Amino acid sequence: ERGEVYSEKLFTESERTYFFNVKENRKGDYFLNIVESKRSPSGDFERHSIFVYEENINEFESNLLKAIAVIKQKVSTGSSARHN
Amino acid sequence: EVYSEKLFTESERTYFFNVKENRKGDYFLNIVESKRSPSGDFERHSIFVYEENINEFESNLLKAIAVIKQKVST
Ligand SMILES: [Mg+2]
C-alpha cells in the first residue's frame, strides 16, 4: 500500500485490538498512527486514533517509556519459590 | 490517578500520558491526544491499555517508532 510504510495489528484477550501504523504524507514525512479498536458489549466497534508527527516522535517515545515504567514497577514478577 | 504527564508541542496537539488504578487495583495506561481547532475547541482522542497487555503494546509501539526514527537519521 502506497502511503503506508508499516502496519501491525495486536490482538489481546480483551475487547481491545490495536493497530500500529506508520504513514507517509505528501512530502515524504512519516507519522505514527496508534489505533485502539474496542468492541462494545452490543457488538459495535469504537475506534480511538492518535497521530504523532515526525517532529515530536522522540519526546512522545521517552514520555511513553516513562509512563509505562510506572506500570512495569507495579506489576508482580516470576519470584526455592513455588507459585500457584 | 497514579501518574500524569503532559507533553506540549509547538503544534495544535498536546499529549497526556496517564497511569490510573481501577477498582481491583490494576493499573492501566491512558494516552490522550488534545487537538486544538482554529475556533479554539479541543478534540480529545483517548487510548486505554490494561496492565496485562502493557509489554506487547510497548514493544509494538517501539517497533513502529523505530521505523520513523530510522528514516529521520537517513
Ligand atoms: Mg480479543
Side-chain angles (χ1 to χ4, degrees):
Chain A
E1 195 170 334
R2 183 193 180 200
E4 302 283 315
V5 178
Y6 176 96
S7 187
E8 190 69 27
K9 184 192 205 172
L10 173 61
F11 284 100
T12 76
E13 285 178 26
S14 85
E15 66 291 342
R16 299 183 204 266
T17 304
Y18 306 90
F19 299 81
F20 300 87
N21 304 319
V22 177
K23 289 149 131 72
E24 184 168 2
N25 67 358
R26 137 116 90 153
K27 338 203 253 135
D29 298 336
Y30 291 7
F31 60 94
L32 177 70
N33 165 222
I34 311 157
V35 182
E36 177 199 336
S37 182
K38 192 212 182 191
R39 192 190 183 274
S40 62
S42 61
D44 303 302
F45 291 89
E46 260 184 17
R47 276 192 168 137
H48 307 278
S49 179
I50 283 163
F51 287 88
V52 189
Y53 301 94
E54 212 183 76
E55 72 261 18
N56 306 153
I57 209 67
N58 284 4
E59 284 184 288
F60 183 83
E61 182 192 45
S62 63
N63 267 283
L64 174 91
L65 290 174
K66 286 179 193 190
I68 287 170
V70 173
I71 298 168
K72 294 187 299 198
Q73 265 166 238
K74 185 259 175 190
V75 112
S76 107
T77 77
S79 330
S80 225
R82 335 140 173 175
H83 76 99
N84 210 327
Chain B
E1 186 165 71
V2 177
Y3 177 97
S4 189
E5 190 64 29
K6 319 175 178 187
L7 171 64
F8 288 102
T9 73
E10 286 182 305
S11 293
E12 301 150 78
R13 297 167 206 265
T14 304
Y15 307 88
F16 298 85
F17 302 88
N18 305 318
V19 177
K20 288 150 139 141
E21 185 169 3
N22 68 356
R23 274 177 191 157
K24 292 220 297 187
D26 295 340
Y27 280 17
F28 62 90
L29 176 71
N30 188 199
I31 309 158
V32 181
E33 185 191 338
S34 233
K35 233 247 88 69
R36 291 193 297 274
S37 295
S39 61
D41 303 301
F42 289 91
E43 254 187 20
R44 212 181 142 90
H45 307 283
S46 179
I47 284 168
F48 289 88
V49 188
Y50 300 111
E51 208 185 274
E52 72 256 27
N53 304 131
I54 212 71
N55 292 323
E56 303 70 27
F57 180 84
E58 184 186 43
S59 62
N60 270 285
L61 190 37
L62 292 173
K63 284 179 201 82
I65 294 177
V67 166
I68 300 181
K69 291 180 76 181
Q70 199 232 262
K71 177 256 173 194
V72 182
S73 73
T74 301

